[PDB]
Design a protein around this ligand. Structure first.
Ligand SMILES: [Zn+2]
Ligand SMILES: [Zn+2]
Lengths: 39, 1368, 57
């Protein structure tokens, strides 16, 4: 059952990362605050 | 100096309504202008304005009192008079009435001179074309097959050009323009006397001033005022009308269009009188109605007539918006407009796109132009996050796939996001292609994927970008300096503030005069964030000339730092990242561009010679895209481009800077309506201001927008599972939707299936474009199963439709260049006639027209002299003898004449050696009777001019004949040396040298003073040497009218140079007088040369004799190339005919075949299979070792060494000299030079918008085979032969002909021809002169590279050389 | 107890999926300058670039 929770938390990881990237893109889409790419 | 900087001859600036209003209110001129018509000018205190500018008021008051005296009823106020005062757009139906036939003699003399000169060459020109046809086909009806009707000769062409309608109007307005320009020159000089001209002709009174023209017609009782710019528009438009009507009268191909064009002109002229400036809306609607009528005959029922009906609705809206016409009247007017477009072939419906500029241009106002951009911008726009992220994911996929297709098939440095699946991790690890179906699935991870630094791009990578002049705005603190001082003086006085300083600096001059200019520090302006804080930044628009559509009526200008940053960013994008996406087909190479366009258009045209293929084409207009781009939709693309380039923040600069600044339209006669708004920041969003524009500007950051559009097109194609081939070009994008259909299906059903397949793709594309914020309307998109539009040219069923009338409408009587020589104008006319030949007009008619208008231009320049001369002996000698005019106009340009169009130019664009072609045409004219053999003897026996070693090598194929180069080129060169010697920039530190001319003369002597002279080799080696690179960089300068004026101001010409530039035309005519007057006494060995001698032999003798002073009898080799027409002895085989060259000995030929049963605009199955025709072959190295990332200097040095070794020899001293000459540009040692240099065998010696060479109507069905031929001069010769044969086949079936009831065969035998010759070269010629002391810009990176090879590269090249030496 | 977190985590998984759904269908809107207020007044925005990392980095 632990392997099942690990496999499902992998999906939790990927969907949480998708949400994080989507919110980052949104925040960087405000013309009010100019943004700079690292390096 | 004022006799060089003459006022414009043609229109190049926008027409301003308020300028005319200012000039008619300053002098209190009679007018029926309403108070709102004047706008801000009604509130001016004209008394103070009249008190100042005393001379202008004197002239305007003189014009007013004369108008009152001649017409007493003009005093009648409150419009109780019957005289009507009409502004420009409302005088269209009266322009034929304004005729000063009496009290005007110069146009009459010009017409009689042109007639008498043309009458002496018409029969000779007819014989010339008859002989050309007889040689090229063996039959005398090559040019008259389609028309045989009436065959118009040069005499007929002249008669119908001078006796047409608009001829009297074009003579009257030519006189008006001539007098106005004379008055302007006199006023600028400072005469201040007799600056008012009155013609007082019966029924048409005209008063001309340097600033206004008062025109009154008694027949219509209408009085109008025209400013100088409006006078230039009217005379350009009337010349265009004359040209279009006369060509429709002359050509049997355009004959059906004459009546329709006449009725269209009449109807829209009355509509113009009725409405005013809104008739240009109707004109712009007709612009699209041409395409709407073109798609009215497609097989698909569900797409037939949609655009037609929608455009009819929009024209009804435009006619009923002001309630000028009721619904019934508007419908009747629409029917009258439409009836002129129906029952025409597709080619003619496209050639009704000439009428666009036949009605002039609207009077522009800053407020009206600003309203359109204030609404596209500053407007709320909703966008879809997912649509932006999906197109961003596809953008990343295309970038990665392009970087894989280059750089040895490896992924860019990338960092996968935390959401990436296992499959994406494996594809990154394996460096495998990202299939678009995979991307559409996992678009949440293909995106959010940070591509790291991929390019070692530098701002100073390209120098040509920094040396182009771009309009720059004034600093914000003084933004009112654009406006006229008179209008703003009082509003500034009432505010107790100083008058703003006028701004006249240019970007080029500002960049040139910078002691500390580093492109890295220039880009730091944007990168550091200083641009968003600069209080000096100011951007403004300005009215755009020669535009009739509401959109695109303005162009923007920025400050110097932000223009430099913009050009640097655009260069960075266009060189590294723009190259990575080639999902579209547009490339800088025009040849493969049009080849790709033809292939794209011919997708669905498959014959019967299972499943087949079908195509539905979609065309979208992207003009309003620039105003609709928003930061929130571009920031992710900008961020990933910044990451790939290493810049923290560069590309998302336009929107960020625009939202924080107030824009405005800068027109000197359009000040703000409110005089209390003296600062840009506090301005409101009205009048001429555009407060905080959220969008982008046209042209600016276009690479990023084009890349986003390509990504969106690919996303939409993948979403619909449809194959497409986009051809995005910034303004117009063309998409060829492709689907698979049953072969046995009917053509109509095949196209219906193609449209049904394309429906889903079009819906997806509309949804995607709306998601990224671009709403697609019915006007923009054009869905058709037959044609698409690219670069304003339509691709209809495997053809490019002609649109020759558009080209003929811009064939005027003078060039806009400053020198205003006769040679420049004749060259312009020849270029336009070349366009006419390429656009389907009869080649015989085009040749006759070229001769006629060259004669017409020379006669006009003779009888309308730009500058007064004390001695008129030359002008009288040319005027009193029209035979001299004819001889000069028929003489080819290379020999000193004005005939810039060659007989071979009718067929081949690529001419090779122009002197051989000129000699061939001289022979043709001599044998027909146009010229005389003693003219050829005079040219051969001509005394050598003033030429140096630099002139023989700078431009080969040229003779030592004086005055061959126009004064325009001299002015351009003077401006470039005057700017280069003024340059103090860190870049170009060592480019300029005072003894550069002497060094180039010594180097040209080094290359040329050998046993055999090879001007091609000298030209190449010079162009790839340090001196030649400095010449090239100095030639990178723009040489613009403003730049030329600045050069003449800061560096005045000497008195002798002033006089020679002013009287170049008279000196050139006097120079020709020695050859085109009488038979001179010539040396006797010239009697061997006859009209039967091959043109190559005569070219050899003529170049040997011309440069005799320079070369002392030594020959010139490597130049001559056989003339295309004279090389081939063609034969057309018809039915029972048998080829006469094959039947008699000769067996070398290029076989051409056209199948029978072809019907254009008919079922593709019936006619034979189609294919992309032969349109040309550009350059296509096998070096010892291939170097990757080689610098420009390294490539130039390798080119120099290879050419030197191939031409002069392969001894050890021939290698030492080449090594030194390369050492003027690189730092390689002798061993690696020898090793890296490409093969010195068969050196091509190749040395250096959308204009197709033909319509490719019947040339797409033509079979070609050189199986009976030998086959790098020979390759070019045979390509020329194939192109000539294709053009011959195409002129056999002219655009009037659309069928092929018989199969034809063309042989085109090049064998048994005197012109083809053996080739011997690559002998050892050592230098008879020591190597000159070549000064070298060692420090300058753009000329010399201290480290062109890396340590690893040096090791690899040494290993390769050692392996070759040992391995053998 | 470890069995209890198994079912509760499945509840979390589903909401995270659901939030993602809505986040994927959000609308990015640009206000524009409909009011037409002087830029001076509209200038309520950073003049300085901020080097914040979006997504990977
Ligand atoms: Zn033959
Ligand atoms: Zn020959």
């Amino acid at each position: 059952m632990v392997t099942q929770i690990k496999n499902e938390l992998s999906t939790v990881k990927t969907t949480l990362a998708t949400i994080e990237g989507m919110m980052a893109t949104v925040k960087i889409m405000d013309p009010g605050n100019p943004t700079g790419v690292p390096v | 100096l004022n006799e060089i900087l003459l006022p414009e001859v043609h229109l190049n600036s926008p027409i301003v309504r308020y300028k005319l209003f200012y000039y008619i209110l300053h002098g209190q001129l009679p007018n029926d202008l309403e108070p709102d018509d004047l706008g801000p000018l009604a509130n001016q205190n004209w008394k103070a304005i009249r008190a100042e500018e005393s001379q202008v008021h004197a002239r305007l008051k003189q014009i007013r009192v004369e108008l009152i005296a001649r017409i007493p009823s003009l005093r009648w106020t409150r419009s109780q008079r019957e005289i009507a005062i009409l502004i420009w757009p409302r005088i269209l139906p009266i322009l034929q009435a304004y005729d000063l036939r009496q009290s005007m003699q110069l146009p009459t003399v010009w017409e009689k001179l042109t007639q008498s000169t043309v009458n002496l060459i018409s029969d000779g020109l007819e014989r010339v074309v008859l002989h050309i046809s007889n040689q090229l086909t063996g039959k005398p009806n090559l040019f008259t097959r389609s028309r045989a009707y009436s065959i118009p000769s040069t005499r007929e062409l002249s008669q119908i050009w001078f006796n047409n309608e608009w001829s009297g109007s074009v003579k009257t307005w030519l006189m008006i323009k001539y007098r106005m320009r004379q008055l302007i020159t006199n006023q600028k000089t400072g005469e201040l006397t007799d600056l008012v001209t009155i013609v007082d002709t019966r029924s048409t009174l005209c008063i001309i001033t340097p600033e206004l023209v008062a025109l009154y017609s008694s027949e219509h009782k209408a009085l109008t005022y025209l400013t100088f710019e409006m006078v230039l528009m009217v005379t350009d438009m009337l010349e265009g009308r004359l040209n279009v009507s006369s060509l429709c009268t002359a050509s049997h191909y355009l004959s059906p269009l004459k009546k329709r064009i006449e009725v269209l002109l009449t109807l829209v002229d009355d509509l113009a009188l009725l409405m005013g400036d809104k008739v240009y809306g109707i004109v712009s609607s007709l612009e699209s109605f041409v395409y709407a009528q073109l798609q009215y005959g497609d097989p698909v029922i569900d797409i037939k007539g949609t655009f037609y009906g929608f455009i009819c609705n929009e024209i009804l809206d435009l006619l009923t918006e002001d309630n000028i016409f009721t619904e019934e009247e508007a419908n009747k007017v629409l029917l009258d407009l439409t009836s002129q477009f129906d029952n025409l072939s597709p080619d003619l419906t496209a050639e009704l796109l000439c009428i666009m500029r036949l009605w002039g241009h609207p009077t522009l106002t800053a407020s009206q132009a600003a309203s359109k951009v204030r609404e596209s911008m500053c407007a709320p726009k909703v966008l879809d996050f997912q649509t932006i992220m999906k197109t961003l994911a596809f953008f990343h996929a295309i970038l990665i796939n392009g970087y894989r297709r280059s750089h040895n098939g490896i992924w860019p440095p990338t960092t996968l996001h935390g959401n990436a699946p296992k499959s994406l991790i494996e594809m990154r690890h394996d460096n495998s292609e990202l299939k678009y179906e995979y991307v559409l699935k996992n678009w949440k991870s293909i995106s959010m994927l940070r591509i790291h630094k991929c390019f070692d791009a530098s701002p100073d990578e390209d120098l040509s970008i920094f040396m182009k002049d771009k309009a720059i705005s004034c600093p914000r603190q003084d933004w009112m300096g654009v406006f006229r001082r008179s209008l703003i003086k009082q509003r500034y006085r009432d505010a107790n503030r100083p008058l703003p300083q006028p701004f006249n600096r240019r970007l080029l001059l500002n960049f040139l005069e910078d002691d500390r200019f580093d492109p890295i520090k220039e880009l730091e302006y944007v990168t550091s964030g200083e641009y968003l804080r600069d209080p000096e930044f100011c951007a403004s628009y300005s009215l755009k000339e020669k535009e009739i559509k509401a959109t695109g009526r303005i162009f923007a200008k920025m400050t110097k730092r932000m223009r430099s940053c913009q050009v640097i960013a655009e260069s960075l994008l266009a060189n590294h990242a723009g190259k990575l996406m080639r999902e579209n087909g547009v490339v800088l190479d025009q040849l493969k561009l049009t080849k790709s366009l033809l292939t794209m258009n011919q997708i669905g045209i498959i014959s019967e010679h299972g499943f087949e293929i079908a195509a539905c084409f979609l065309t979208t207009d992207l003009t309003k895209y620039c105003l609709n781009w928003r930061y929130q939709v571009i920031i992710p693309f900008a961020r990933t481009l910044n990451s790939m380039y290493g810049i923290p923040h560069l590309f998302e600069w336009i929107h960020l800077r625009l939202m924080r600044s107030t824009l405005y339209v800068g027109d000197p006669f359009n000040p703000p309506s409110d005089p209390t708004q003296l600062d840009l920041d506090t301005a409101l969003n009205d009048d001429i201001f555009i407060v905080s524009p959220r969008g982008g500007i046209e042209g600016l950051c276009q690479k990023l927008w084009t890349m986003i559009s390509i990504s969106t097109i690919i996303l939409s194609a993948t979403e619909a599972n449809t194959r497409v081939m986009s051809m995005v070009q910034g303004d117009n994008q063309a998409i060829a939707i492709t689907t698979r259909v049953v072969r046995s299906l009917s053509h109509s059903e095949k196209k219906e299936q193609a449209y049904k397949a394309s429906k889903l793709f079009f819906e997806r594309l509309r949804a995607n474009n709306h998601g990224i914020g671009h709403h697609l309307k019915e006007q923009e998109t054009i869905l058709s199963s037959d044609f698409f539009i690219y670069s304003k040219r339509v691709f209809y069923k495997g053809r490019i439709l002609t649109q020759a009338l558009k080209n003929v409408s811009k064939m005027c009587l003078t060039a806009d260049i400053l020198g205003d020589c006769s040679q420049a104008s004749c060259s312009n006319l020849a270029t336009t006639v070349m366009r006419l030949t390429e656009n389907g007009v009869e080649k015989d008619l085009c040749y006759f027209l070229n001769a006629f208008m060259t004669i017409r231009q020379l006669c006009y320049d003779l009888v309308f002299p730009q500058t007064k001369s004390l001695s008129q002996d030359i002008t009288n000698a040319y005027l009193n003898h029209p035979i001299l005019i004819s001889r000069l106009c028929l003489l080819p340009s290379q020999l000193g004449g004005l005939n810039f169009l060659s007989c071979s130019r009718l067929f081949n664009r690529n001419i090779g050696d122009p002197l051989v072609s000129a000699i061939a045409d001289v022979k043709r004219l001599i044998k027909a009777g146009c010229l005389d053999i003693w003219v050829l003897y005079n040219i051969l026996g001509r005394r050598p001019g003033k030429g140096k070693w630099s002139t023989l090598a700078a431009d080969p194929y040229t003779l030592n004949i004086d005055y061959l180069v126009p004064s325009t080129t001299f002015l351009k060169k003077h401006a470039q040396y005057t700017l280069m010697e003024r340059s103090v920039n860190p870049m170009l530190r060592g480019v300029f040298s005072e003894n550069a001319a002497e060094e180039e003369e010594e180097l040209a002597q080094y290359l040329l003073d050998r046993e055999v002279v090879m001007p091609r080799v000298a030209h190449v080696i010079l162009a790839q040497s340090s001196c030649g690179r400095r010449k090239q960089i100095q030639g990178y300068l723009d040489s613009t009218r403003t730049i030329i004026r600045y050069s003449l101001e800061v560096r005045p010409l000497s008195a002798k140079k002033l006089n020679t530039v002013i009287e170049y035309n008279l000196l050139y005519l006097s120079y020709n007088l020695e050859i085109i007057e009488k038979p001179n006494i010539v040396q006797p060995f010239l009697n061997a040369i006859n009209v039967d001698t091959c043109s190559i032999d005569i070219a050899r003798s003529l170049r040997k004799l011309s440069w005799a002073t320079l070369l002392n009898g030594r020959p010139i080799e490597g130049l001559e190339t056989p003339d295309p027409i004279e090389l081939v002895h063609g034969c057309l085989i018809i039915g029972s005919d048998e080829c006469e060259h094959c039947s008699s000995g000769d067996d070398k030929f290029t076989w051409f075949f056209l199948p029978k049963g072809i019907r254009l605009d008919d079922d593709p199955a019936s006619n034979p299979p189609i294919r992309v025709p032969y349109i040309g072959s550009k350059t296509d190295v096998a070096s010892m070792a291939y170097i990757k990332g080689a610098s420009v200097s390294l490539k130039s040095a390798l080119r120099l060494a290879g050419v030197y070794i191939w031409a002069f020899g392969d001894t050890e001293e021939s290698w030492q000299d080449a090594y030194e000459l390369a050492s003027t540009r690189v730092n390689l040692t002798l061993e690696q030079l020898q090793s890296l240099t490409p093969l010195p065998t068969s050196a091509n010696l190749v040395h250096r918008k959308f204009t197709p060479a033909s319509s490719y109507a019947f040339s797409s069905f033509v079979h070609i085979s050189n199986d009976c031929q030998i086959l790098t001069d020979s390759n070019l010769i045979y390509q020329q032969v194939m192109i000539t044969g294709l053009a011959l086949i195409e002129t056999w079936n002219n655009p009037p002909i659309n069928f092929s009831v018989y199969e034809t065969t063309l042989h085109l035998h090049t064998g048994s021809s005197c012109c083809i010759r053996p080739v011997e070269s690559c002998v050892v010629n050592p230098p008879l002169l020591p190597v000159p002391l070549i000064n070298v810009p060692q420090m300058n990176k753009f000329v010399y590279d201290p480290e062109p090879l890396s340590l690893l590269e040096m090791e690899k090249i040494e290993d390769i050389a050692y392996q070759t030496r040992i391995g053998g």
